[PDB]
Design a binder for this molecule. Sequence first.
Ligand SMILES: Nc1ncnc2c1ncn2[C@@H]1O[C@H](COP(=O)(O)O)[C@@H](O)[C@H]1OP(=O)(O)O
Ligand SMILES: Nc1ncnc2c1ncn2[C@@H]1O[C@H](COP(=O)(O)O)[C@@H](O)[C@H]1OP(=O)(O)O
Ligand SMILES: O=C(O)c1cccc(C(=O)O)c1C(=O)O
Ligand code: NA
Ligand code: NA
Ligand code: NA
Lengths: 357, 347
Amino acid sequence: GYTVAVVGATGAVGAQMIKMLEESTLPIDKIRYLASARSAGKSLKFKDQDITIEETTETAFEGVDIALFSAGSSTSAKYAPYAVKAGVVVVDNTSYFRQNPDVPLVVPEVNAHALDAHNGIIACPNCSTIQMMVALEPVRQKWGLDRIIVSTYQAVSGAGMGAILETQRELREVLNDGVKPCDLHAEILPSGGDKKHYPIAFNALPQIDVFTDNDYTYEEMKMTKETKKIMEDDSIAVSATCVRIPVLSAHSESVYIETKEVAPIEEVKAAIAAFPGAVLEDDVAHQIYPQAINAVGSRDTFVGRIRKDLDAEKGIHMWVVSDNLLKGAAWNSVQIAETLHERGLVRPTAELKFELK
Amino acid sequence: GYTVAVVGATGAVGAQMIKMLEESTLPIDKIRYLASARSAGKSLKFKDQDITIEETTETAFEGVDIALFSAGSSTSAKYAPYAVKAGVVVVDNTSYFRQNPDVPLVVPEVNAHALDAHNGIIACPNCSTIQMMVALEPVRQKWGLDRIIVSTYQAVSGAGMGAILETQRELREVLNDGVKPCDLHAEILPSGGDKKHYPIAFNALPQIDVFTDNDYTYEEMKMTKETKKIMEDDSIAVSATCVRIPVLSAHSESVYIETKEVAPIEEVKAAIAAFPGAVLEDDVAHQIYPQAINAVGSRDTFVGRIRKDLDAEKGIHMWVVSDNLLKGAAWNSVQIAETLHERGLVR
Ligand SMILES: Nc1ncnc2c1ncn2[C@@H]1O[C@H](COP(=O)(O)O)[C@@H](O)[C@H]1OP(=O)(O)O
Ligand SMILES: Nc1ncnc2c1ncn2[C@@H]1O[C@H](COP(=O)(O)O)[C@@H](O)[C@H]1OP(=O)(O)O
Ligand SMILES: O=C(O)c1cccc(C(=O)O)c1C(=O)O
Ligand code: NA
Ligand code: NA
Ligand code: NA
């Protein structure tokens, strides 16, 4: 069996990492929960066992076979390289290593083969990217993809526990105390790293992450760059708009694509149905389509509203929904670890390829 | 002045029509409030003066100069032709007449000229179409429009006062009683006129109105058809995805366009700023962009996140926000009535 560590065990993703591990096919001999100094000494369950939480440090990874990181990019930057040096295989949820050419960026249903060449770190893509890749890969395999335009409808749990509690508080102030939305005080959203903060209650915020130089956000640009790496095709054009809405869990996405060859609409639907990890939920005659509230708690990615563009011959619109803390994060990560186990890839790396900070 | 009638004065839109008329430059001598058989008798205000709500009948429109209809297709299909008969000029908020080739479909800042050809009835377009037209007309004027792709983020107030209440009750049950969103009971959304109902609380519902043969909803097809008619150009390719989200008032839209000639972004921003009814709010260095919660109560349409596509030479993305009961409905209507007055078309 393995020694498995969860870095960021106390966070929103971490909680789901624990659940996914509890329900895993991974043979686990020993579990370790890591967080900041603040949580160290506190206790948390793994199934029935009480596990004492430890401080994450340069020296915390001795004896660990697999570490799952979900404690922000800065934490992965500081400590993941030390875990690799110690002989750990790291599965990282953060953005920090995703564009490093020595790091596979993996959704197992799409590009599991890229795991073969890892050097101790495997990166999980951004939550919004993962579910879009699950929906579109089966289409790409058969008809190709020329371009993608996507508008996202993103739940607040992606920004962490703080963001969840802030959203709950704001809704309660409005609905129970009669505070007007524009009078609400916010501290976290749209981005903890940015200067100004805005209410999410009864709002739609077209900012996720900070702005980059080209006036897209980092979240938008992550979708673009991650898509091309995962699909191994820099020729695919991708432009995104990423919007936070008042949803606690499950991202939805309005996705437009143009295929390389015309894709018969009903075959597109069949291909998506046949693809592992994707569930076709598309029957408009009976008002059947993916919804955020029904996706919460499932590892599947749900696709519907599938239809031709009204004018573009190769154009197709769809609606994609998935639990952003499961396939979007914790489940993708644990699925990666299971795949590494199944293919004999859980072993220390020969050469260190990551700078110690 | 004029005798003005508000049909459906008790509803979500009706209540705003009253506010807009109260604040209007339209010279009003008498105001009449019309609704259904079971509102008939109560009293609504016009400024500080009581108005008896009257039932809407075939004969209740005699003596009326201008009638503002906001009470669903049903009410407008039956009673508006009788109002035109009685010499009334009708401004219709509903979808019923919108594609009638004898009925102008008007956003005043865009195609006011179309009011000249009217024959008793003016159609106000759909809320989500109007704000899109205000934002895009200035770009079309200067560089053309080849195609539009839009994904909307629509507030619940567009589906009626009943939808607003269902939303607030649903949210309270989740946050106060701990009910799981997927277990909530729903009566209205996504569509009051469709077979099944779903919760909106902590949800996003990809259905506005009912479905058509081509698997787009009627809301989506209205955006497509009304755009062509308002801009008087059938060659503009338009496809929409319309989504309800847990917002009470103000629609937002993620809008993608391709122009006919390349349009420099700074010139695009300047053209929208210059266009009447559009306000530029776009300064990402200070996280300035349009937001539903700030747009509530304003007649303006707000545009930002304006940026070029990363690959398409003529492609442009933007974010457009406006109060759906104001510019999206009541203010557009009252603006039409004011325009008719000013251009001497109320006869
Ligand atoms: N310097 C750090 N070292 C290790 N873990 C950290 C550090 N800073 C934050 N974390 C962890 O990242 C996660 C953040 O989750 P979320 O964003 O959902 O709150 C938490 O588990 C948090 O632990 P802690 O709870 O000890 O602060
Ligand atoms: N058959 C009808 N004749 C006239 N008005 C109607 C009829 N049915 C509904 N209405 C009005 O349409 C509006 C709908 O409002 P909303 O869409 O916000 O629920 C209300 O003012 C309602 O008035 P009433 O209050 O009498 O039902
Ligand atoms: O570290 C963060 O602050 C963070 C927070 C939410 C999402 C992400 C991510 O890129 O998926 C990230 C990130 O890894 O950059
Ligand atoms: Na499948
Ligand atoms: Na065209
Ligand atoms: Na302007």
